[PDB]
């Protein structure tokens, strides 16, 4: 082979993104766009290993509380403005500022940056945040507790810089295609809502000399069977994650070498609205957990290597090893189901007067299949005491419904943002901006709070096991399985491994070969 003269690629991104402003979003389709247009302090290769981004060098004090980043002195934004430490100060302050209403506001609290939580609570002004431009090219981060995993946290979309001069001038409109300015490998060529996003090289990117792909198109195909049919017709080069379960064994044999799949740091759940009747009743949350047979979903509905789970954190994540699956998961279903029926009758439900709710999910045939199966099991397993409807919404609408609390039970799927257990544990803090379940237990908050001071991995791992135990005894959610990330990838696409624990995909890591 050799490199193709044309370096164009078409990738399914799966949904129309909520926004291209990383302070306004919390989803994978959105981050996939942001990572092409913007670059944070540190970035990664195709396997998720760290490499210099906007910062060419960095260091930490021995107590893991002070992090210093040396930015590139000649780096520019795509409009020619210099990239400076002031852009990072600006962006990080904007993320925690309540006026931004950022879904990931809490991420800086997770990093333990001084005053981040007070600012999110409105007790201090965003300028009190513990980050500084010591000079134009030196950005320093001050944490209140040891955060030895800090560098990995800095790769997340929510900590991408923004072009201060542009955003201050244009406000939220900076994001329009005509106005967008970034320091990633690409820039926006075109955007047709619900159809396509087109990328072109950002020639001012500091590492443009190593970018190979010249142009790329993201599609917004919601259903896996549509994705696969487009791929087969040669009209896209990489599917989104997820393949039709009925086709999976065949695809693997027929398109041998094109199907990538591995276990993923992700958990699929039904999130229960803990402040909406009747899911504010732990008894009912418990009955739903008891009566859902996870193995039906992972073995009969899906069958792609998803593994059943009854806890939120994947136990194979770094420092997750002490977390235990709850004892009910070891009971026969017949025992679990009788228990669930008693709970529901104790709560006043009967065949004539069942527990009625809708499963909210984002349009996607695989989510539909899982919801049909869940509805079916809950009804049958409780002998008619639960009656479930399905409510499918387009991605953007689904996201807004979850955040607004306009749901009873919602399909959910959380991917690790960094390879350390707190990317999951921190989600269920009572004051987390990510916690759309409205779960709140001060004991849970305290078990996580006590982990942040811990000096070592075992002490952190014990605290995460306790947090999970409290969340599990509260039945705060309904965990179903841990993800795998099956995707089809054409044989002429190289640089994709699928082995990145954060499952980032950077166009600047790909290339097209010929023959």
């Amino acid at each position: 082979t050799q490199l193709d003269e044309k370096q164009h690629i078409v990738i399914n991104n799966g949904a129309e993104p909520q926004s291209f402003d990383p302070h306004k979003t919390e989803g994978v389709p959105e981050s996939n766009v942001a990572y092409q247009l913007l670059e944070g302090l540190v970035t990664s290769d195709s396997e998720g290993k760290l490499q210099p981004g906007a910062a060419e060098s960095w260091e930490n004090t021995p107590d893991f509380k002070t992090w210093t980043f040396h930015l590139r002195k000649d780096a520019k934004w795509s409009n020619g403005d210099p990239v400076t430490a002031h852009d990072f100060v600006f962006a990080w302050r904007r993320l925690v500022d309540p006026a931004t209403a950022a879904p990931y506001a809490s991420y800086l609290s997770y990093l333990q940056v001084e005053n981040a939580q007070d600012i999110i609570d409105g007790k201090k002004k965003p300028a009190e945040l513990g980050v500084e431009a010591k000079d134009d090219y030196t950005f320093v981060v001050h944490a209140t507790n040891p955060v030895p995993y800090a560098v990995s946290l800095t790769t997340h979309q929510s900590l991408l810089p923004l072009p201060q001069k542009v955003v201050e001038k244009l406000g939220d409109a900076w994001v329009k295609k005509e106005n967008y300015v970034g320091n990633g490998a690409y820039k926006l060529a075109n955007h047709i809502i619900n159809e396509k996003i087109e990328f072109e090289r950002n020639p001012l990117y500091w590492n443009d000399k190593e970018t190979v792909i010249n142009s790329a198109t993201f599609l917004a195909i919601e259903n896996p069977s549509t994705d696969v049919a487009r791929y087969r017709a040669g009209d896209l080069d990489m599917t989104s994650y997820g393949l039709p379960p009925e086709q999976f064994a065949k695809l693997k044999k027929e398109l041998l070498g094109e199907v990538y799949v591995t276990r993923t740091l992700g958990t699929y759940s039904y999130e229960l609205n803990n402040k909406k009747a009747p899911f504010d009743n732990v008894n009912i949350r418990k009955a739903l957990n008891l009566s859902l047979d996870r193995n039906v979903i992972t073995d009969k509905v899906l069958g792609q290597g998803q593994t059943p789970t009854y806890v939120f954190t994947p136990t194979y994540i770094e420092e997750g090893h002490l977390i235990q699956q709850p004892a009910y998961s070891k009971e026969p279903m017949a025992q679990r189901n009788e228990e669930a029926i008693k709970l529901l009758e104790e709560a006043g439900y009967s065949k004539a007067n069942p527990l009625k709710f809708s499963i909210l999910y984002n349009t996607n045939e695989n989510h539909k299949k899982v919801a049909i199966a869940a509805a079916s099991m809950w009804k049958a397993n409780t002998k008619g005491l639960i009656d479930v409807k399905l409510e499918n919404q387009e991605w953007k609408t689904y996201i807004d419904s979850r955040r607004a609390g306009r749901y009873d039970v919602a399909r959910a799927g959380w991917h690790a943002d960094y390879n350390q257990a707190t990317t999951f544990g921190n989600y269920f803090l009572s004051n987390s901006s990510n916690n759309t379940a409205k779960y709140a237990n001060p004991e849970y908050d305290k078990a996580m709070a006590e982990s942040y001071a811990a000096t070592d991995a075992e002490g952190r791992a014990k605290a995460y096991a306790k947090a999970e135990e409290i969340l599990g005894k509260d039945y705060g959610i309904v965990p179903i399985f841990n993800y795998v990330n099956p995707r089809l990838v054409k044989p002429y696409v190289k640089g994709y491994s699928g082995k990145d624990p954060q499952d980032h995909i950077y166009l600047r890591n790909l290339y097209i070969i010929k023959h």
């Binding site: 799966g14 949904a15 919390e26 989803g27 994978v28 389709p29 981050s31 979309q157 896996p224 989104s240 994650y241 997820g242 992700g266 699929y268 899906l302 984002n362 996607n364 695989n366 989510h367 899982v370 991605w395 996201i399 959910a412 799927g413 959380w414 991917h415 943002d417 993800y483």
Partner: peptide, 6 residues
Amino acid sequence: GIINTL
């Protein structure tokens, strides 16, 4: 991050 797919 919220996963859109399955």
